[PDB]
Design a protein around this ligand. Structure first.
Ligand SMILES: [Cl-]
Ligand SMILES: [Cl-]
Ligand SMILES: [Cl-]
Ligand SMILES: [Cl-]
Ligand SMILES: [Cl-]
Ligand code: NA
Length: 129
């Protein structure tokens, strides 16, 4: 599923990401835009053999099991394929664990390089929330 900008904002709000650990909703929408272009089915392989999955490009090296990342962890206790669903619940719940682990949203390279320090409120401007 390719979300629209305001559609995704509303879904993330319903699932409790607005101001979660202090990060306003626009931060999460911006991260999703540049990680996946709002596409729940996005995948990308990393140099070390791990793979990033879904609208927030969560990494199999630490967070989910895909059966092909030897020596990795599965800290969200989910198969990585569950992060590709049109229902974003699994991605959101895993992202909550990630952002709570001490490094905040700096875990998302695209957030750090393209969202951090910008006017992220523009990502939810005009949306009915
Ligand atoms: Cl957009
Ligand atoms: Cl915001
Ligand atoms: Cl594995
Ligand atoms: Cl949902
Ligand atoms: Cl933080
Ligand atoms: Na893994």
């Amino acid at each position: 599923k390719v979300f629209g900008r305001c559609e995704l904002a509303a879904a993330m709000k319903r699932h409790g990401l607005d101001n979660y650990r202090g990060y306003s909703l626009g931060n999460w929408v911006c991260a999703a835009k540049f990680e996946s272009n709002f596409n729940t089915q996005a995948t990308n392989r990393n140099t070390d053999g791990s793979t990033d999955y879904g609208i927030l490009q969560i990494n199999s090296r630490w967070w989910c099991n895909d059966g092909r990342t030897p020596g990795s962890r599965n800290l969200c206790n989910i198969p990585c394929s569950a992060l590709l669903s049109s229902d974003i619940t699994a991605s959101v719940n895993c992202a909550k664990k990630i952002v709570s682990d001490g490094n905040g949203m700096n875990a998302w390279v695209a957030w750090r390089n393209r969202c951090k320090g910008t006017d992220v409120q523009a990502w939810i401007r005009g949306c009915r929330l």
